[PDB]
């Protein structure tokens, strides 16, 4: 049971795409959230996709970002556009089995965590 | 004849986990979709069944156990877990069939100065068996010396208040938990979905 | 953000006395136990004394036999350990600790076990000739 992120330098105005692919379990029933942490700042919620497929954006910044899931490939994608230097951080995907529409902004409530991939702008 | 899930999930007060409450649900129509098709539950984990298809299932009885624990402890309400809660308070069996549903209740169950009414058993001589409930309050002999009815070092009152405060970190905030056990008995079903 | 600060340690001759202080700040809980523990060099930490916030009830380890007294000043949020008839066996780092109390069936219960919610950094006590 594992989460593996991929897709992280780039400079302002560019686009990057991050993927979270899971092993050892099926991600259909899980909500997947992306959290990021910059040096010297708190860990912050980026975006989340519920088991239903609904999208929620947490950071007022990214409200420029899109999130999607491919149940068939057991993966989730975060599309980052119009990159800025304030978007430099370690990005994490996390999985939690909640109710159908649940997507929580608080990282403490998520069971499963990826390894984390650095995005530098 | 709808099943009284509201009385369970929306009860004003919940039990302490060491004295966890059980409600028998029988002879009614169960609409589980009101639970699963919501944004309300940070934990909604089913064992042996699919959450999307609960309304297709028929059981002789459904048991609804409910109680409050810390957020960091919700993971112990699962088959095969260990820790103070699974070991000494509420133990699920390896072959559990049912759903574990939980949600943050900081808005109802924390108090400035601490809410002391929710307790858990912190000391016990041996682990609980699945679905065992222990409400005894004998002084726990932690060392070789008998306690003889006096509390002291190595002679402990066995229950502990959480003392939830609204400023606690989320891992230390109160979570309400409802465990639905689906009884698999070869007998006439009395709890079926609407269909 | 509870913080515990121990003061009052130092050197003393066998048979002498010391008064330690545990100054608590940031305490938001209404009911709690405060304990004094000690760790002698090369040995495991052990409880010395326990006091309950609501009524000042106390208990002691057997090692203390009547020579130590724990007490609280509520107006100063400070807990004292008066240590009399000190012996070389008493040399140790002394820690104070705070943990949440318990309400059960109309009464409060206070327990200082080896696991406490909050710990001070400790103060050295040395009993020597
Ligand atoms: C327990 O809570 C409420 C009681 O008001 C029931 O309904 C929820 O709240 C409003 C009221 O219509 C609506 O959003 C939904 O009906 C419920 N919320 C969500 C997020 O679905 C709720 O159904 C009750 N639970 C039961 C009966 O199991």
Numbering used by the authors:
A (entry chain E): 2 to 9, 11 to 52, 52A, 53 to 64, 66 to 82, 82A, 82B, 82C, ...
B (entry chain A): 334 to 528
C (entry chain C): 1 to 52, 52A, 53 to 82, 82A, 82B, 82C, 83 to 100, 100A, ...
Structure paper excerpt:
The SARS-CoV-2 spike protein binds the cellular receptor ACE2 and catalyzes membrane fusion. Conformational flexibility of the trimeric spike protein allows each of its receptor binding domains (RBDs) to exist in two major configurations: a “down” conformation that is thought to be less accessible to binding of most neutralizing antibodies (NAbs) and an “up” conformation that binds ACE2 and most NAbs to the RBD. Structures show that the nanobodies target two distinct epitopes on the SARS-CoV-2 spike protein.
(A to C) Crystal structure of SARS-CoV-2 spike RBD in complex with VHH E and VHH U at 1.87 Å (A) and detailed interaction interface of RBD (in white) with VHH E (B) and RBD with VHH U (C), respectively. VHH E and U bind to distinct epitopes on the RBD. VHH E employs its complementarity determining region (CDR) 1 and its unusually long CDR3 (22 amino acids) to bind the ACE2 binding site on the RBD. Of the 27 epitope residues that bind VHH E, 16 are also involved in ACE2 binding. VHH U uses all three CDRs to bind the RBD. Binding of VHH E and U does not substantially alter the overall RBD fold [Cα root mean square deviation (RMSD) = 0.37 Å between RBDs bound by E and U, and ACE2]. All structural analyses of VHH U and VHH E in complex with RBD were based on one of the two copies in the asymmetric unit with closer alignment to the localized reconstructions of VHH E with RBD and VHH VE with RBD using cryo-EM. An SPR-based binding competition assay revealed that the nanobodies bind to two distinct regions: U, V, and W competed for the same binding interface on RBD (interface UVW), whereas VHH E binds to a different RBD interface (interface E) and could bind to the RBD at the same time as U, V, or W.
